[PDB]
Design a protein around this ligand. Structure first.
Ligand SMILES: Cc1cc(/C=C/C#N)cc(C)c1Nc1ccnc(Nc2ccc(C#N)cc2)n1
Lengths: 404, 552
């Protein structure tokens, strides 16, 4: 059976041109796809289909096996009514409190439901050839594709059916679905946890389905205030700007008693003492930053934004927000390697945390030249979704107001 | 013939239905010509006469071809087209010669009546019905509809190219070593076999082709390589750009300089070290295509350089897939980069240039990196593989630029090559403040209405200075004030500023800028021996922030 699927009123299908791929990925893609086609998952299509989304290959993780991956960002955006506000998958506010969360791939399940025939033409993609020497191979999807936010939505019915008993039998276990992934969490000891996962996969395995998060051990990266033996004017100027900025966030942040000591035109290198009022105002903020931003709350109707600074020496800070400065979450991430590799990993990390916490993928402000990112990110990418990103130079000040 | 291939279903855009355009009356002889033509076509299948229950119409004219007095039938699909569905873009992206593999023998074959050789989708023919008007239009015209793909219709290039691919599929599969390229109604056939074996597989391509409705030029006439194509000249072993003659004029119009700048740009694909900065400088400004532009010394110089670079022929080789690509880049001028790509030095597959500036300010290191990215992408397209780079930069210089720089970056496997100029950083800012160096709390400001500005500074050594600028902005004053501090200070200076705008610029360690101010601040910074730049929150009430804020 097939659920009747439709775009949003107005918008037409996606027409995204294929990114250039390497001989490696193309070869890979041609196999994958001739096997998917002599299995009826995808069919070759004519010029009468004007639509495209981009495809590419990865090998998942430490795995020597290529996997097709389709960029459905545009289509998802252009169907978005359907996969959110008609049927839609509710997000457990407890998943983020669990001792352990396991993520496992249930994408393949989709491969067995047929797709609405009057929607298939929107899932067209092209396998490009090198130097454009021949016409790319064009395909549509017949079954539910991975990457498309219709697929979990269409399968909601069949999925809870499949998990019904396991849920009955372990009522204290959380299972949340997002795209092609199942999130399974519990508070059991790690060993009893893993056992409950194999029990789960046995259930899945009857329908077709052959890593570990520890969300507690998630805590904030406070804006850290340098602790010091002496202080130079410079050191304090540094300090005052940094408290100065925090005020644009954390209510209660005081500054006056400190910039007290920056009086007149002193030499930057000039060691100047530290009065009791300042020594006190200093400590005061120290605990405010320790704490969650008073006043900020997640709005479910608003895009999440995440921003990343490069710290150097393999450090990366990042913040998550909906309106700037009002931070829902901040953090770091650290350390074969490569400036771009790290970021691409950091993106995936932050995205993962972001899904667990809000059931939502952030839109990333990436501190890198657009063209560099595009050339390389598909090389370190091991996730099955793709967030939205835009590129931006990091104002120099911000970088350090967040440094550790 | 009308190829026996299956047809492509086509529909009008979701709202509408076929056009209904009235036929303009035509002179008595244009009417005669159309009837002759359509009788011809009709007997071939291309068109079919229809009963006027069919609502649809599209205009049709006949222009008197050339001085060679025959007539040609034009149709106006403006309206059917507007109302027809969008198709998969035919081929977008075009093969570069430098990407072609070498081939022993090559043949061109041209399809005849390509468009009229492919069938149209039944359900859609109805909408392609036109009308031949009666003399002085007094009675009903004759009405035909298309059976094959009309020239000038929206979907013709798409369906045709698709059909030709569907038909070639068999041959290509049963012959994966012979190469075909389809460009429109052209087929070129590439083989690494001898003049006999090749005419052999050619002649049975033709046979396979005629089995499907497509006729081809006999093995007797008339094309042998070299071939001209999309601007290139392909030989079986090498390629080049097709002959480009640069004019010898005493007077150069804007239009003459455009065509030159574009012939040179074309040339630069295979002619190493073409430069055009000086010829493009002319074009800056707003002038008419016919206005004459007198050449500068530097531009006349350039024309000179280019003119000799072209005086002897040059060709690119083809790509041997089993060897690494090597990419060398050289600095050729300010913001100007040239590169060559080869597999055996120095027989180039291709050369290129790069002169894009990103932002108002950069330094060589940023620019060289952006050319590596350019070249890399280009590589992926043309060869599906990144090259190994040789760059006029030391590993230390680039290791230093990146680690300290705040944008993520990464270039593929590369190695130093000593080809001057070499890229360096021309100054580096201190990391910690400098003991024993005068501290300038500087500060620029502008009144947004007057656009009148006062820039200045105070030091920890009592010094002061405030000067006045006319029609600048807050931005300029803040850069002036830092420039100030640099010209009055000595070789070790600490500069404190409340301008994040200014800090950002300078902290980026530029070495070229569109701004003259900035280009000076730069001059200064290279002269200094140590400089530390600090930021402070303006108006917050800081040491020398408020102090020299009094002076502004
Ligand atoms: C893209 C392309 C343009 C022309 C354009 C033809 C024209 N005009 C002719 C052919 C046959 C092809 N296709 C391919 C594919 C792979 N290797 C080659 N090598 C190759 C092609 C032509 C010559 C020649 N002369 C030498 C080597 N050609």
């Amino acid at each position: 059976e097939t659920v009747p699927v439709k775009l949003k009123p107005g918008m037409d299908g996606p027409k995204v041109k294929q990114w250039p791929l390497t001989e490696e990925k193309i070869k890979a893609l041609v196999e994958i796809c001739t096997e998917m086609e002599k299995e009826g998952k995808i069919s070759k299509i004519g010029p009468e289909n004007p639509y495209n989304t981009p495809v590419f290959a990865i090998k998942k993780k430490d795995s020597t096996k290529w996997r097709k991956l389709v960029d459905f960002r545009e289509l998802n955006k252009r169907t978005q009514d359907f996969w959110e506000v008609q049927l839609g998958i509710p997000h457990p506010a407890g998943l983020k409190k669990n001792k352990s969360v396991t993520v496992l791939d249930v994408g393949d399940a989709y491969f067995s439901v047929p797709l609405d025939e009057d929607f298939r033409k929107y899932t067209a993609f092209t396998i490009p050839s090198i130097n454009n020497e021949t016409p790319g191979i064009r395909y549509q999807y017949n079954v539910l594709p991975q990457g498309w936010k219709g697929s979990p939505a269409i399968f909601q019915s069949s999925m809870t059916k499949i998990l019904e008993p396991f849920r009955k039998q372990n009522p204290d276990i959380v299972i949340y679905q997002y795209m092609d992934d199942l999130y399974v969490g519990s508070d059991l000891e790690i060993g009893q946890h893993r056992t409950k996962i194999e029990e789960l996969r046995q259930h899945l395995l009857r329908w077709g389905l052959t890593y570990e998060l520890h969300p507690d051990k998630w805590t904030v990266q406070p804006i850290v205030l340098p602790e010091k033996d002496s202080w130079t004017v410079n050191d304090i100027q540094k300090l005052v700007g940094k408290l100065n900025w925090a005020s644009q966030i954390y209510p209660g942040i005081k500054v006056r008693q400190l910039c007290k000591l920056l009086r007149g035109t002193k030499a930057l290198t000039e060691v100047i003492p530290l009065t009791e009022e300042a020594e006190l105002e200093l400590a005061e903020n120290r605990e405010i930053l320790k704490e969650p931003v008073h006043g900020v709350y997640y709005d479910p109707s608003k895009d999440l934004i995440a921003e990343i600074q490069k710290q150097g020496q393999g450090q990366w800070t990042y913040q998550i927000y909906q309106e700037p400065f009002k931070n829902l979450k901040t953090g770091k991430y650290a350390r074969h390697t490569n400036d771009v590799k790290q970021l691409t990993e950091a993106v995936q990390k932050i995205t993962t945390e972001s899904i667990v916490i809000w059931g939502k993928t952030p839109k990333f402000k990436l501190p890198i030249q657009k063209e560099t990112w595009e050339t390389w990110w598909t090389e370190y990418w091991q996730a099955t979704w793709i967030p939205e990103w835009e590129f931006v130079n990091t104002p120099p000040l911000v970088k350090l107001w967040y440094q550790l | 013939p009308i190829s026996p291939i299956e047809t492509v279903p086509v529909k009008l855009k979701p709202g509408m239905d076929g056009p209904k355009v009235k036929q303009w009356p035509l002179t008595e002889e244009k009417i005669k010509a159309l009837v002759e033509i359509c009788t011809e076509m009709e007997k071939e299948g291309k068109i079919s006469k229809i009963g006027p229950e069919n609502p649809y119409n599209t205009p049709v004219f006949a222009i008197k071809k050339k001085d060679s007095t025959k007539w040609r039938k034009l149709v106006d699909f403006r309206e059917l087209n507007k109302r027809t569905q969008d198709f998969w873009e035919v081929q977008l992206g075009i093969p570069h010669p430098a990407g072609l593999k070498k081939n022993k023998s090559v043949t061109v074959l041209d399809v005849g009546d390509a468009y009229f050789s492919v069938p149209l989708d039944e359900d859609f023919r109805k909408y392609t019905a036109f009308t031949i008007p009666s003399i002085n239009n007094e009675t009903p015209g004759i009405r035909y509809q298309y059976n094959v793909l009309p020239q000038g219709w929206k979907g013709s290039p798409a369906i045709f190219q698709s059909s030709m691919t569907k038909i070639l599929e068999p041959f290509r599969k049963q012959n994966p070593d012979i190469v075909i390229y389809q460009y429109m109604d052209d087929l070129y056939v590439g083989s690494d076999l001898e003049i006999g074996q090749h005419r052999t597989k050619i002649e049975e391509l033709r046979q396979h082709l005629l089995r499907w409705g497509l006729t081809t030029p006999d093995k007797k006439h008339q094309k042998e390589p070299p071939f001209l194509w999309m601007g290139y000249e392909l030989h079986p072993d090498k390629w080049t750009v097709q002959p480009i003659v640069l004019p010898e004029k005493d007077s150069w119009t804007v239009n003459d300089i455009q065509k030159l700048v574009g012939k040179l740009n074309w040339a630069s694909q295979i002619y190493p070290g073409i430069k055009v900065r000086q010829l493009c400088k002319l074009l800056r400004g707003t002038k008419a295509l016919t206005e004459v532009i007198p050449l500068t010394e530097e531009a006349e110089l350039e024309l000179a350089e280019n003119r000799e670079i072209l005086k002897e022929p040059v060709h690119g080789v083809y790509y041997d897939p089993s060897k690494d690509l090597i990419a060398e880049i050289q600095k050729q001028g300010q913001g100007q980069w040239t590169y060559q790509i080869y597999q055996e030095p120095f027989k180039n597959l291709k050369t290129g240039k790069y002169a894009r500036m990103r932002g108002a300010h950069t330094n060589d290191v940023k620019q060289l990196t952006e050319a590596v990215q350019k070249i890399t992408t280009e590589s992926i397209v043309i060869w599906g593989k990144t090259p190994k780079f040789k760059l006029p930069i030391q590993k230390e210089t680039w290791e230093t630029w990146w680690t300290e720089y705040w944008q993520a970056t990464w270039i593929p496997e590369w190695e130093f090559v000593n080809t001057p100029p070499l890229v360096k950083l021309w100054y580096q800012l201190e990391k910690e403040p400098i003991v024993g160096a005068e501290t300038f709390y500087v500060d620029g400001a502008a009144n947004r209405e007057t656009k009148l500005g006062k820039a200045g500074y105070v030091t920890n050594r009592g010094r002061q200075k405030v000067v006045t600028l006319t029609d600048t902005t807050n931005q300029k004053t803040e850069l002036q004030a830092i420039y100030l501090a640099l010209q009055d200070s000595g070789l070790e200076v600490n500069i404190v500023t409340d301008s994040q705008y200014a800090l950002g610029i300078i902290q980026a360690q530029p070495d070229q800028s569109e701004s003259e101010l900035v280009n000076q601040i730069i001059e200064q910074l290279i002269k200094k021996e140590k400089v530390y730049l600090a930021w402070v929150p303006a108006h917050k009430g800081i040491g020398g922030n408020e102090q020299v804020d009094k002076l502004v």
